Amino acid sequence: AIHVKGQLPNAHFHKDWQRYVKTWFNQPGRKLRRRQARQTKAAKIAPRPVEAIRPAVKPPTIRYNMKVRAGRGFTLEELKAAGVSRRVASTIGIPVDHRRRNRSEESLQRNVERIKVYLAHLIVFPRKAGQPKKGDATDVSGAEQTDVAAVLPITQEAVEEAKPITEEAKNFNAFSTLSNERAYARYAGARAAFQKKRAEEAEAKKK
Amino acid sequence: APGLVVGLNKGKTLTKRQLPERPSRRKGHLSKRTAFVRSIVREVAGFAPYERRVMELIRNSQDKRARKLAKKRLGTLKRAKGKIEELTSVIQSSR
Amino acid sequence: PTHTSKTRKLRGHVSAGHGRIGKHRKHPGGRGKAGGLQHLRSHFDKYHPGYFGKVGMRRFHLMKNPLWRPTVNLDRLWTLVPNETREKYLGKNTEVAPVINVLQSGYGKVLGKGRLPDTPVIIQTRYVSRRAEEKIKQAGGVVELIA
RNA sequence: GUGAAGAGUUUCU
RNA sequence: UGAAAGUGAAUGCAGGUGGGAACGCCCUUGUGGCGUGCACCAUCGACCGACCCGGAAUGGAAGGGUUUGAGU
RNA sequence: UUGACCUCAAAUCAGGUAGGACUACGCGCUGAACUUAAGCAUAUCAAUAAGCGCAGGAAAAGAAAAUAACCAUGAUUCCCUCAGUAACGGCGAGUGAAGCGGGAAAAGCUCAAAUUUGAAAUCUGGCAACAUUUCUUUUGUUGUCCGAGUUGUAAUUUCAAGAAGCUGCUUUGAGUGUAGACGAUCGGUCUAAGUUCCUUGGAACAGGACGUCAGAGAGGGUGAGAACCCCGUCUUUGGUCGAUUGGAUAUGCCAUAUAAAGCGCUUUCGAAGAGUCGAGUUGUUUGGGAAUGCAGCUCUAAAUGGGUGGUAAAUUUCAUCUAA
């Protein structure tokens, strides 16, 4: 029975939990196996970069919308703006995401510059050796495997160090603005309904 | 666009652009050839017995009874009103 | 370790510290915290009041990301800026005023607790309390709302 | 499923 | 803090009182007088949230309370 | 009378295929009770034990009829966290996810719905020839004939699009040999060093003296504790076969290689899965709460239609996705 100090017990061990215990004694082995696998992948795909170029996106919540992270693939609009076909992007190592869309010119330009930087730093080996075609590089001799993020990393938004204080800032009432906006956001529908009902009733009385 | 976290148009203000047309969102549009095929199929077949009963009720002008019968036959009232509108169009085209 | 355990000291004592009368039988008062309303009531009502019953209204599918809003007080506002900015701006008169991005520091609302130095500052935050705004204005700074 | 009678634009026996 | 929408902690030396570690100064050898006073306890207040008010479309700012919180 | 078509038969017809075993992990069906609730029926044990069907080296899942409500994200899977939280529960005992975020790994796609109609361009089988092989054991090509197929086999399309068009933009795989290597490699190792003396002992591999090697003082055996007695251990190149365009100017050099794709402006169209969605009821299950999923029965859809947006209903908008 419960007779001791502390919070009441909450242990969820009323099933046969001992037959589904997951130990981690293979953690160093798994780490070594994954390292060996990625080393083998790097050797087999050399001199291609280990990690493909990824876009910069904003996380979808107010908890994280102030940060920038790596996306899945570049949108069709970004590829068209940068001058890369969707079929050639996969061949040259540019992921394509058909689901994402550019709702803002900021995100569109942010990813377009990334594609342009990747294209500028990219060496395209000719399909036939010694015959550089359209877009191929004539100086493929000095080609080596480099980190994509080492030249094109994901960058966070910078804050402004300082700026002069404005008279509009002096006269701004932040708390009053927040309270008024909060009240307006919920009562605007009621006010609009009241105006519509008043107009309908006035017209009906006129009839 | 107040540019705040509260209000009707809250959120950060950016340069909004026009999104491209999504081919998948075109679903639900009626094609000329699809409408022609459906009209031919309607001519080849007839009407379901519940559809005929609803049409008879509409002709009798028992609108509430026809709506109740259509709602019970098809489920939701939204589909009932759609069927009522379609059958009314069929009746007035016959007239 | 095992050699420092009380079990080693109990070797040779028949009852092993559990008594000769009551012994150490299996569960004699039930399993877990069962009986808190009938025979464990004298313990539940004395040490865990409010355990039994319903209070409040349910919220189906609660998601805490839209409700995320950690707070920072005024006395910690100047801590958020680096030391170099503090030396460059605190205690001196400048044409421009330093900007403290509370949201970038990792908070959603600015609360008014403690005092502020008599130097202007630009506080960028999603929310701010009324008392914090008064103290910032008294100190000479302004608060501009951000999304 | 298909038809014939009785009955206060419809279906009960 | 409230069920929640929400709101969200300095009148002052971050307050007053009593006991109080340690220290310092005087007595004049007494279980000594004075000055501060950490910790902790008791107590009177102040501030924040909730409740109940006056009540001076939307807002609850000064004014309050015999209260309440696992708060400052 | 016959032939053709359709349907249905028989053959020890020609060629194939399935069963069964293994069950740690995997995909499902079916399915308890002991036990806890200090009794006990809902609950719990447990969507478990037992029973049944079915695979692989992984299986399953998987490229949104997905989240979110944002400055928006973006196939699936797994780990941390979310979180013992939202929620469920004689609201008793107990049970209990998901979005976001960080990381591992990342890869996209294919049909049906189109009239090729200036030529079914498609495919299987028999026969013959010519090639090929992990291989006389394997895998194909060509020609001809017969069948399949118009109750639809091929080609461009799969919504991210795309077709009909309009006008200018560029034009590419397989045989040999060398150097460096890369799997098996094994003609196998240049692969280092005391078994000297004295004592004890049955035996020295013990003690002591004098030495030696060490990229080798891991281990084992030898008549007792052996780096130098033996196998070994450490270090370290090469005879061979094969993958041999896996690469390089893979050179060398055969024909791969003359018309298929390539982006561009402008319009017209843009076919998209039915007893399915959805509604009701019942049973089961779920944290899913006026139903989370599944199943039985009844009703039964539509084309800016339909699904989702976690409180039932009606109405008006908005966002996202495009099921069967």
Side-chain angles (χ1 to χ4, degrees), chain A residues 49-54 70 114 118 146-155:
Chain A
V50 161
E51 217 78 17
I53 174 66
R54 298 289 171 176
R114 293 181 65 86
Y118 182 82
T146 82
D147 173 328
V148 160
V151 48
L152 191 31
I154 305 289
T155 316

Side-chain angles (χ1 to χ4, degrees), chain C:
Chain C
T2 288
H3 80 269
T4 52
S5 62
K6 191 181 169 181
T7 311
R8 312 312 309 172
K9 297 303 188 65
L10 284 174
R11 284 279 188 258
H13 307 74
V14 26
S15 303
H18 291 282
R20 291 182 182 270
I21 309 173
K23 314 171 197 305
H24 191 188
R25 295 275 168 75
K26 323 298 283 289
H27 317 76
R31 296 218 181 195
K33 47 181 171 58
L37 261 178
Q38 308 208 0
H39 63 111
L40 303 187
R41 178 178 295 206
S42 40
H43 181 89
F44 272 62
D45 289 6
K46 189 170 301 183
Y47 297 111
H48 305 87
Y51 180 78
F52 299 97
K54 280 185 187 180
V55 152
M57 48 154 145
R58 303 164 300 171
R59 176 165 186 177
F60 298 151
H61 195 243
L62 165 74
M63 287 186 309
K64 301 185 172 183
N65 270 203
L67 304 175
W68 177 85
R69 197 179 70 173
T71 57
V72 61
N73 286 320
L74 295 175
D75 49 7
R76 291 291 303 278
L77 278 194
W78 277 96
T79 298
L80 313 179
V81 278
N83 293 322
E84 34 280 35
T85 52
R86 290 181 50 175
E87 310 170 332
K88 196 192 142 15
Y89 288 117
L90 186 72
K92 41 197 60 181
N93 322 268
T94 45
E95 290 196 9
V96 300
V99 174
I100 309 183
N101 205 289
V102 168
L103 183 59
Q104 232 67 24
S105 298
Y107 313 97
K109 185 169 185 179
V110 170
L111 294 183
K113 183 197 176 183
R115 309 191 187 280
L116 276 180
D118 275 325
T119 166
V121 67
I122 324 186
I123 307 308
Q124 299 186 336
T125 172
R126 298 173 167 172
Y127 295 92
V128 64
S129 69
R130 186 176 46 85
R131 265 144 93 100
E133 187 161 335
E134 313 167 26
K135 291 186 192 174
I136 290 170
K137 288 192 136 62
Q138 263 134 30
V142 298
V143 34
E144 55 162 86
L145 308 167
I146 57 174

